[PDB]
């Protein structure tokens, strides 16, 4: 009937001291972390039932954990399998979970959360059910509700209680909408945590001491949350309040402004559950939250985002592409060649990780201006207060700018960021390859030049490897590791471990012109340029890019990548295949590139492109663009433009998997999202195929029909490869 329960193993340990304080120690024996699994639901149901039974002999409850992490989310393995027909079970599961927490909450006696480590998602939802939260200010301790980042929403009372605690606007912006994780100090600052302790050993004693003092100082209000008292007033007011009702119609429009119209239903569902929940009582609000939760879990976007940002991202971090058996080799001195934006950013993220960096350029003045990129970055970090002056000085002190090739003495890790000329890169490596250590990694930050050709410029080709970064290096989280033919597996592992060391996500790519990121992002740019040549309005092309979910619209990106760079990229791919006796595959976007080069509008670096630029600031599209390409003469559906750019990247990704360029779909999904900004709601350019949804249906079969639908209308380049076909 209406129970605390939904074979499994016990997860909670029971302990009632002489004062009547029961200590519920969550300790899942089937893993290293407490997770809202079927074992927890049964274990918490047993403990809560015993709390109701022994209520006459219990004076307080303390919820603690025996793991290094308090409690980190739920069984994502289970929620990703929830089909639309399983919405009833999903609803009953979260209703049972919140029924247990609601009983623990309304127990008539204080309950304190002893947060020892990370309390994330469902874990923070357990602490929020308690009346008092004490956190241990320790390393790596995080608190937050990152449900939205998996296409879900806080369904275990997270949305209902954070709204009751901070109001609609504060709870949405600060905690719910972006799933922000907080350190224990910041968690106490915003109200998520009530007080802090230095070590984990003081937690449980302080929790029982607070219960001892709360019963003595507040006998009436003990074990009663603020929203359960008489005369509770929600901060900021309810939607019926005259103040909130004036600004409330601007919340969904602002959210659509942030999402840029991208089909992400999770933030919208959070704002709906937050507002609709504030209009009714707590229990009814909680049931509304359950229905929106079951709506997302059974939806396809959540399955895409759960696949990418939970399973795929863990499979990468677990060394899925790291060679087996290879051990760890420390990195003592990093030598960066070139002090451009790339080389300076490389030198920053390396020194930020604690490495000693020797930033070499042609001149001491150039190498000094490169270190200034880290100084102006530490300036903003010290201004907004993200780091201390103590460690900001130690960070810059690890960067040693130089112009002498002898200062690469003792370097066991070389990253090159000079301009992309083959003979140039061969000269730069030749004058340092004998100064550095004999086991030094020789890395290149090329974006198109094949690694096997660059490897001939050194004698230790087995240690030559491609280390492709993305600007700005201080913010872009992906590193494309390219494996040449001679690149050993040890060099692959050391660069793999280096990428994780600087706090970035690696993908391993076999050598091929264009690699994976540059090759796939070309199809995205080329589809837009095609559409412009076909006569589509330039504003519609940019809108189609933003509404697809991309961070930057394509024509705007086509100005940062420079059309002269795009021109010689197409000339190089043509010349290479032509020398092999074949017939190059020309793309219709090439005609639009050459037309813009002729008009003297080659991109942002020139100062004029598809947009007009003033004092280095973009200021609207070029008015002569419409007359040049007869804009308005072709008016296809916006969803066709959106699908033309998404499918182009999705089909090119499938080619890279067929050609062995990628070795795992996890590298393709994370590599597309974090490398070239593929929309996160898709779950990646590889997940988009199996997770496609439209009028043709859902799944790989619908993607194929829609690909053939686009192929008939816009060209056979949208024909699905043989692997996708049954």
């Amino acid at each position: 009937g209406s129970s605390h329960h939904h074979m499994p193993d016990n997860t909670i340990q029971w302990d009632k001291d002489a004062d009547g304080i029961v200590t519920l120690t969550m300790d899942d024996p089937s893993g290293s972390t407490n997770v809202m699994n079927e074992a927890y639901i049964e274990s918490m149901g047993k403990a809560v039932d015993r709390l109701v039974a022994e209520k006459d002999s219990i004076t307080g409850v303390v919820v603690a954990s025996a793991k290094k992490t308090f409690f980190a989310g739920g069984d994502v393995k289970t929620m990703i399998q929830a089909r639309p027909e399983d919405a009833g079970d999903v609803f009953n599961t979260v209703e049972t979970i919140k029924r247990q927490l609601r009983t623990l909450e309304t127990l008539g006696k204080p309950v304190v959360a002893a947060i020892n480590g990370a309390a994330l998602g469902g874990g923070l939802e357990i602490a929020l059910a308690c009346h008092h939260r004490i956190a241990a200010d320790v390393k790596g301790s995080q608190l937050g509700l990152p449900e939205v980042t998996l296409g879900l929403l806080p369904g275990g009372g997270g949305v209902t209680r954070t709204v009751r605690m901070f109001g609609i606007q504060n709870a949405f912006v600060s905690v719910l909408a972006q799933g922000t994780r907080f350190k224990p100090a910041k968690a106490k600052e915003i109200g998520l945590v009530d007080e802090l302790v230095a070590t984990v050993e003081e937690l449980v004693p302080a929790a029982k001491a607070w219960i001892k003092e709360e019963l003595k100082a507040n006998p009436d209000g003990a074990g009663v949350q603020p929203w359960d008292k008489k005369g509770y007033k929600m901060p900021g007011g309810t939607p019926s309040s005259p103040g909130l009702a004036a600004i409330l119609p601007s919340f969904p429009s602002n959210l659509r402004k942030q999402l840029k119209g991208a089909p992400m239903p999770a933030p919208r569902a959070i704002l709906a559950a937050a507002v609709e929940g504030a209009q009714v009582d707590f229990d009814t609000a909680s049931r509304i939250e359950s229905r929106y939760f079951a709506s997302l879990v059974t939806g396809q976007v959540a399955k895409n985002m759960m696949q990418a940002f939970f399973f795929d991202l863990q499979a990468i971090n677990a060394g899925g592409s790291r060679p087996e058996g290879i051990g760890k080799t420390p990195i003592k001195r990093i030598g960066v060649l070139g002090a451009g934006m790339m080389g300076a950013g490389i030198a920053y993220v390396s020194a930020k990780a604690g490495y000693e960096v020797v930033l070499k350029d042609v001149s001491l003045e150039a190498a000094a201006k490169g270190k200034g990129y880290s100084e102006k970055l530490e300036a903003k970090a010290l201004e907004r207060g993200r780091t201390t002056q103590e460690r900001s000085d130690a960070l810059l002190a690890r960067i040693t700018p130089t112009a002498d090739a002898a200062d690469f003495k003792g370097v066991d890790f070389v990253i090159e960021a000079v301009f992309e000329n083959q003979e140039l890169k061969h000269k730069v490596f030749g004058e340092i390859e004998d100064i550095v250590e004999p086991n030094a990694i020789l890395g290149s930050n090329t974006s198109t030049l094949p690694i096997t050709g660059l490897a001939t410029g050194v004698k230790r080709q087995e240690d030559f490897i491609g280390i492709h970064f993305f600007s700005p290096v201080d913010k872009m989280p992906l590193v494309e590791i390219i494996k040449g033919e001679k690149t050993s597996d040890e060099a692959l592992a050391r660069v793999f471990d280096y990428t994780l060391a600087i706090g970035k996500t690696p993908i391993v790519v076999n050598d091929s012109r264009g690699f994976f990121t540059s090759r796939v992002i070309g199809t995205f740019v080329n589809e837009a340029l095609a559409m412009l040549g076909e006569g589509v309005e330039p504003a519609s092309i940019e809108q189609a890019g933003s509404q697809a979910g991309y961070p930057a619209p394509p024509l705007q990106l086509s100005d940062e990548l420079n059309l002269e760079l795009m021109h010689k990229i197409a000339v190089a791919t043509r010349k290479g295949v032509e020398d092999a006796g074949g017939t190059y595959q020309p793309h219709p976007a090439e005609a639009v590139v050459e037309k813009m080069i002729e008009l003297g509008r080659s991109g942002r670096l020139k100062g004029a492109g598809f947009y007009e630029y003033a004092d280095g600031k973009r200021s609207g599209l070029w008015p002569g663009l419409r007359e040049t390409f007869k804009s308005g003469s072709s008016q296809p559906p916006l969803q066709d433009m959106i699908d033309r750019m998404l499918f182009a990247e999705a089909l090119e990704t499938q080619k890279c998997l067929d050609e062995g360029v990628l070795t795992s779909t996890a590298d393709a999904n994370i590599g597309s999202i974090m490398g070239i900004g593929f929309p996160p709601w898709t779950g990646g350019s590889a997940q988009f195929i199996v997770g496609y949804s439209g009028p043709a249906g859902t799944g790989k079969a619908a993607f194929v029909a829609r690909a053939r639908e686009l192929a008939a209308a816009y060209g056979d380049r949208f024909l699905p490869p043989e692997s996708l076909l049954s």
Binding site: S250, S253, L255, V275, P538, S540, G620
Partner: protein
């Protein structure tokens, strides 16, 4: 079957928003004064034939809540058998009350009906009733809620209306409203508002600025709604914001009454029919741009009555925004001398619930003055709707 005739059409002066003369007057008192004026003009009227009172009100809360129509029937001492119903179709609530009244008379089940609206925006501001399109995030995200002002600026951008274009129209409305007042056109219809002691409170449209100059309008000044509008209208790069407080409709208080009945009802009461409701129509357009509803509604009511633009002597569109009227004039190729000939809401104001009934009576008088035959009245509506009515002078 039956034919609907307008026997009377009066209205109150429109009191401005800031320091308005009608701010102290309850909206119920505005309607009761117009009811007493109808008794003054026809003391022989057997009010037992008045079968319903249909009032339009956009914010039916507070002073305007609890079926203000029924309150007006009881408070004014009308027979208890005279019904009383409040409706709401946003800006065209006044004209919808008239249309419904005419439709009830045509149905043969109603003999004599009072219709009109009331809106005391200084006491009950717009949006006070709440709403699901705005306050519910699940549906605000779906219907792409955008304020009417942005949809008006979007129209000016798409149609190529400059800042001088919308301001030149705003100057025209100010001049034609002053010309109509100084010409005594509004003498019979504008019923001055008085207190319980008979002392004068307001006898003119306070929102009018007849000393407006083109230079003064150019010195006027125009939360993510622009991005929401451009997400649907993806071919337009940027919205040119041209509308200011001088080229948009004013926020004013007021009320209007229209006595509609069958021929038999008017003959039995000795009433002289002034105009005949020829046809009405309700249509709509995209709710993001919102204010493009009048064009299909006007087109629909013209085909229903078997009439064309050439057969209409006077066009009366509510001047919610200057671009909405210029867009309407551009679409149907309306002559300049036929469009809002006595000024509009830009000069005199826009009392939401009562505007449809105000411009309706404004055309009844102007049809009799010019001795013209037909007039078409239409309004743009929030949510993308549109209402149009064709009257013929009898």
């Amino acid at each position: 079957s039956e034919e609907a005739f307008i026997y009377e059409a009066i209205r109150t002066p429109r009191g401005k928003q800031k320091n308005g003369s009608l701010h102290e007057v309850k909206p119920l008192s505005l309607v009761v004064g117009l009811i007493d004026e109808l008794r003054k003009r026809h003391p022989d009227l057997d009010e037992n034939l008045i079968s319903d009172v249909i009032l339009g009100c956009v914010s039916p809360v507070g002073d305007q809540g609890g079926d203000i129509a029924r309150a007006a029937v009881l408070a004014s001492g009308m027979p208890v058998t005279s019904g009383g119903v409040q409706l709401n179709r946003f800006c065209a609530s006044g004209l919808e009350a008239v249309n419904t009244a005419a439709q009830k008379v045509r149905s043969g089940w109603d003999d004599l009906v009072l219709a009109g609206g009331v809106e005391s925006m200084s006491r009950v501001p717009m949006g006070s009733d709440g709403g699901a399109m705005g306050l519910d995030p699940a549906t605000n995200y779906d219907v792409m809620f955008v304020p009417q002002s942005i949809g008006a600026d979007l129209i000016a951008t798409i149609e190529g209306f400059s800042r001088e274009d919308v301001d030149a129209y705003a100057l025209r409305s100010q001049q034609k409203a002053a010309e109509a007042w100084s010409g005594g056109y509004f003498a019979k219809s504008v019923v001055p508002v008085r207190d319980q002691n008979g002392l004068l409170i307001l006898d003119h449209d306070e929102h009018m600025r007849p000393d407006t100059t083109k230079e003064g309008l150019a010195k006027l000044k125009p939360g993510g709604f622009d991005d929401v509008a451009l997400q649907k209208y993806h071919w337009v790069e940027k919205i040119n914001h041209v509308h200011t407080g001088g080229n948009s409709s004013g926020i004013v208080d007021g009320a209007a009454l229209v006595m509609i009945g069958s021929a038999a009802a008017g003959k039995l009461q000795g009433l002289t029919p002034r105009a005949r409701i020829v046809a009405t129509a309700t249509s709509g357009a995209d709710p993001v741009i919102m204010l493009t509803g009048p064009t299909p509604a006007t087109r629909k009511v013209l085909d229903r009555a078997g009439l064309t633009v050439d057969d209409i002597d006077l066009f009366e569109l509510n001047e919610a925004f200057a671009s909405v009227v210029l867009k309407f004039q551009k679409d149907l190729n309306i002559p300049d001398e036929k469009l809002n000939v006595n000024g509009g809401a830009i000069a005199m104001g826009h009392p939401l619930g009562a505007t449809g009934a105000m411009i309706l009576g404004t055309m009844v008088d102007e049809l009799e003055r010019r001795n013209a035959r037909r007039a078409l009245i239409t309004l743009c509506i929030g949510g993308g709707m549109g209402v149009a009515t064709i009257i013929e002078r009898v």
